[PDB]
Design a protein around this ligand. Sequence first.
Ligand SMILES: C[C@@H](O)CCCC(=O)CCC/C=C/c1cc(O)cc(O)c1C(=O)O
Ligand SMILES: C[C@@H](O)CCCC(=O)CCC/C=C\c1cc(O)cc(O)c1C(=O)O
Lengths: 302, 302
Amino acid sequence: NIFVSHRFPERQVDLGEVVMNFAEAGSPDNPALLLLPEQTGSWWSYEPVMGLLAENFHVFAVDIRGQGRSTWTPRRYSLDNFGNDLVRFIALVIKRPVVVAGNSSGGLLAAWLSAYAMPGQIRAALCEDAPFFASELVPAYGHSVLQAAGPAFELYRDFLGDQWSIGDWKGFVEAAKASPAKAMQLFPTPDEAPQNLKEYDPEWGRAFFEGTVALHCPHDRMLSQVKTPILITHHARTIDPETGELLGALSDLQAEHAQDIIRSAGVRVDYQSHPDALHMMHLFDPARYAEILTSWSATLPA
Amino acid sequence: NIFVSHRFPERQVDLGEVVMNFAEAGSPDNPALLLLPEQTGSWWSYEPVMGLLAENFHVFAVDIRGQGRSTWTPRRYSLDNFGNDLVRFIALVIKRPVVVAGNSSGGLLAAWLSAYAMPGQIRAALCEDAPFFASELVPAYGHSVLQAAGPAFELYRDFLGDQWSIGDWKGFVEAAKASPAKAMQLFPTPDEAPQNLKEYDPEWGRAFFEGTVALHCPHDRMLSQVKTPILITHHARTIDPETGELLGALSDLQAEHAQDIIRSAGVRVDYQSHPDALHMMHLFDPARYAEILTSWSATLPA
Ligand SMILES: C[C@@H](O)CCCC(=O)CCC/C=C/c1cc(O)cc(O)c1C(=O)O
Ligand SMILES: C[C@@H](O)CCCC(=O)CCC/C=C\c1cc(O)cc(O)c1C(=O)O
């Protein structure tokens, strides 16, 4: 009960297990657009850009399970459960085919739906800076989660704890600043826990760090099972020259393989590299993100 | 393409990732009934009893993913993925509230649905000798899969292999007889691979033995989340005095706790002990099973 006000009305739908919170904008005569936030991001990660997209889409921004006003589900955090929630959401609330756009963790889920959603649910998928492979424990190519974003997710577990059962925010901030992981500086460490983190279940991080979230969803297989056109945006990424860490969502090599996997599935795939963009372009450069999304959606078949 | 003819015509439906095969009997004027086979059993596990149930029910017998003519999905075998398939099947095919009756592993999925199905999909669930706890790697109570049926699933994996990739049936029968597990005698060892097993993906067994099939579906939490009346039929079970092995689906101690967890959820629960009935009662005593189901179904609301 730590939530705040926002610039769109919020509504909740019972999917069976999770009660998913979401916001709605746009005209139902425009194409439906499902927005999936990143890890630690609530639906209002897209709040600045929703005004822009609502001009041309009927947009649905949702709180994914274990986040925001949506239901926290201990012991049940997996890409399969995340995606099937979204399958039920599309079927119970949207009731039309959708273009799905997801940032990072949400990008993995946009690709998850394009491969494993109910027939006809997904017209196309936008993957904004998705950590393909780089979020797996034992990826088929390139850095593992332990060599990229792992350290921050490990701290969420060790200091915030499942369902905020530890809550040592001060201890987390000090461990983060003192961590030898160069990628740790990509995660914010304010003196007071930010709103999005307070709406976040740290067992997300435990699941990504321990390799359990995508145990049943190997990325090389998921990417080969997609059935709808996919757009891959690749933002800032660098390999630290002292520690070898991946500072970014995925490496150049991992993005190449993901393109080749999709291409071999016979599915249209486009790739845009934005090496100066921030990880969450939809939030910190919503104008640029809206243009990319709106333009790419215009090239999709009706 | 090793399938055999059957009394009831078969039909397939695309659920998105799994193309599910099923057989339909009875009239839509009677209550819908979804039958879930056991592990290694296809829909025609119920073929001998569907004639009786078709006199009072709109019967749907399905091949669960990784079994029969339903899709085999390597690496994605989980209770959540099994259940979400069945959620899709009810939504796409049945389109009406159902009573779910599953045997063994299928009983776990009936309870899974009672907890995690879409709102209104499930009227009640019948769990026929379901291995609650005894099929978990680290159960909350009682024996683990390693002290029950695990040894047989271990042989399925070692000698048959994922997707019948090893296929050393004669090596399996040899290892089954030499096994020190007294519970090994509950599993068939014919000179030729039985038909039901040739339609079965042994990665099923790997998942139950390695503790991955229900890693994200702890039974104690799942049972606490049921939302519909439950009927638990407990068939033959015995504890070996030397090795302590559980010979059967679940122990008396486990069944008692499952009753407690459901009762504390404020949900109706009934418990019928048939300690002389075989595991697959619906197959070897179809009249007895059908009567139990039909009599119990009569006491349901609406
Ligand atoms: C070959 C198959 O029919 C099993 C043999 C039946 C029998 O004679 C006694 C064992 C009862 C429990 C089995 C069981 C146990 C588990 O831990 C998990 C399962 O999925 C089953 C399961 O069968 O689904
Ligand atoms: C931390 C945030 O402010 C972004 C700053 C740039 C950065 O940290 C590297 C890019 C990958 C970032 C996160 C990430 C990593 C994963 O392995 C999985 C994820 O779901 C995310 C995720 O959901 O964001």
